[PDB]
Amino acid sequence: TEHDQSTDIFSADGRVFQVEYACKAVDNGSTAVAACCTDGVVVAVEKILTSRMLEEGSNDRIHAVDRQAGVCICGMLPDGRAVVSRARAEAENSRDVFATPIPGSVLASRIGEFMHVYTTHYAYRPFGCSVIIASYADDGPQLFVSDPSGTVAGYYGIALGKGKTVAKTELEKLNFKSITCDEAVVKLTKILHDVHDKSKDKLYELEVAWVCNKSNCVFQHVPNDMI
Amino acid sequence: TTIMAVAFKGGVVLAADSRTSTGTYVVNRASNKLTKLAEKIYCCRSGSAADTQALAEQTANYLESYEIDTSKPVNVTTAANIFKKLCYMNKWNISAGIIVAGYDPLNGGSVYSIPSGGSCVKLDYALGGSGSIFLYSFFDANYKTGMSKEECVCFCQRAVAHAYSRDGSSGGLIRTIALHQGEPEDMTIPWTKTPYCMEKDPKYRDLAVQNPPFSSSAKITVNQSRSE
C-alpha cells in the first residue's frame, strides 16, 4: 500500500488514488446546485458559517471570471481560489490576444487542462475542489463542472457536495426547456433549504448568482431581496 | 499648394487653393497664387513663395518691355520661354513649379508646365504643387476635351476642392481666372461654399467603430458614448 502517496503513480488496477482522495474532500464539503435555463444560468451554494461574527460576504464561493462568466468553488476554498485566478488569466488572454469574450466551452476546457496537470507530477497534489462554470458568451448559456481529475462535462442541471444525492433527485423534477432564471432562483433555493442538515451545521447562509438576459449578460450575485 | 490650368476652346482657366504654410501651421490663409504676367498671360505659382514671386516679377518686367518695343500683345510661348530660362538657370538655388497659361490671337489658349529642374512642356492641362498627386486619377477619370468656359471653371473648382480636402498643405479659398479673347474673369469661392469636402460628404458622416463598449459578445455595433 505504498501506491497511494504520490499522484505520479498508477495502482495495479489502473486507478490514481491521490485523485480519488481529493475527490473525497469535495464530497464532504458544502452542497451547491446549478441550472442552465432558457435565458441564462443560475448557481446557488450553501455557505456553512464557522462563527456568528463573520461579516457578510466572507468566504464567498462564487467569483466572477469575466464580464460574462463566473465560477462556484465546491470543496476546499483556497484551492478553488487558485483555479479562479487561472480562469481570469484565460478570460483576459482571450480578450487580449483574440479580441473575443472567451466561449464557455473553451474556458471550461482550459480549467480542466489546468486541474489535470496537478494530477501528473510527483511534486504537486491534485486540487481539492470542483469548479462549476457558468457562462453566457456568444455560444449561449452554458454550465460546466471541472473536477480534481480534470474531467469536464456540460450539464443542464447539477449538484455537488454532501447533499448531492437528494438535490439530484429534486433537480430531476424540473423542466429544462421552459424554466427561466427567475423561477430557478426560487426552486434551487428551496432545494438547498431541504437538503440542509440541522443537527450538524447550525449556521449557514445561501449565496446565489446568475448570468441572464435580465442582467444584460453580466455575471453577478443576485440582489439580496429575492430569496 | 494645388495649382492647375486647363485649355478650352478659345482660352484657358487657371485655378488655385489659397494656403501658404510652414509645414504644419498656416501663415497665410488667403494667398494669391494666380499671378499676372501680361494682360492675358498668368502663371500659377507653387513652391517657395519668395522664389516664385521674384521670378514672376522678373518675367513680367521683361514682357512689358518687349510689348512696348514690338508694339504688339505678347504670345504665350514667349512668356513661357522667358520664365523657363529663369527656372533653368537657377535650378539649384530655388524650389519652384510653375504653370504659364494665357490667351493670344495667334495660337489661342495655351498651357505650359514648367516643373522643378526647368523643363517646359506644352499641354492641354497641367497640374502642380503638393496637391497635384491627388488629381491625376481625377482628371484621367473625369476630364474631357471640348469643355466650354463654364464647364471648365466649374470642373477646376471641383478638382481643387478634391485636392485640398485630402492634402494637409492646401486649403482655404478657391481662386480661378478665365482668359480668352474677351475680358479676364476672376472668381473666388469661400471654403463655406466649396463644392466638395469630406466634412459634408455623407459617406463620412457616421464614425468608425473604434471604441466599442466592454461587452459580453464579440459583436460590434456602436461606439460607446457615455460612461457606464
From TrEMBL, chain A:
Pfam family, one: Proteasome
Record's keyword annotation contains Cell inner membrane: no
Domain Proteasome alpha-type subunits: start-end pairs: 3-25
Gene Ontology process terms (BP): ubiquitin-dependent protein catabolic process
Main location: cytoplasm
Cellular component annotations (GO), alphabetically ordered: cytoplasm; nucleus; proteasome core complex, alpha-subunit complex
Keyword Cytoplasm: yes
Protein's cellular compartments: Cytoplasm; Nucleus
This protein's UniProt keywords: Cytoplasm, Nucleus, Proteasome
InterPro entries documented for this protein: Ntn_hydrolases_N (IPR029055), Proteasome_alpha (IPR050115), Proteasome_alpha-type (IPR023332), Proteasome_asu_N (IPR000426), Proteasome_sua/b (IPR001353)
Family the entry assigns: Belongs to the peptidase T1A family.
Function: The proteasome is a multicatalytic proteinase complex which is characterized by its ability to cleave peptides with Arg, Phe, Tyr, Leu, and Glu adjacent to the leaving group at neutral or slightly basic pH. The proteasome has an ATP-dependent proteolytic activity.
PANTHER family hit by this protein: PROTEASOME SUBUNIT ALPHA/BETA
Protein's UniProt name: Putative proteasome alpha 7 subunit
Organism from which the protein derives: Trypanosoma cruzi
TrEMBL record, chain B:
A GO MF label: threonine-type endopeptidase activity
Role description: Component of the proteasome, a multicatalytic proteinase complex which is characterized by its ability to cleave peptides with Arg, Phe, Tyr, Leu, and Glu adjacent to the leaving group at neutral or slightly basic pH. The proteasome has an ATP-dependent proteolytic activity.
Compartments it resides in: Cytoplasm; Nucleus
Reactions performed catalytically: Cleavage of peptide bonds with very broad specificity
The protein's assembly and partners: Component of the proteasome complex.
Stretch of the intact protein here: 55 to 282 of 284
GO BP annotations listed: proteolysis involved in protein catabolic process
Protein name: Proteasome subunit beta
Organism: Trypanosoma cruzi
Family that this chain belongs to: Belongs to the peptidase T1B family.
One GO CC annotation: proteasome core complex, beta-subunit complex
Keywords: Cytoplasm, Hydrolase, Nucleus, Protease, Proteasome, Threonine protease
Active site: 1 (nucleophile)
Entry superkingdom: Eukaryota
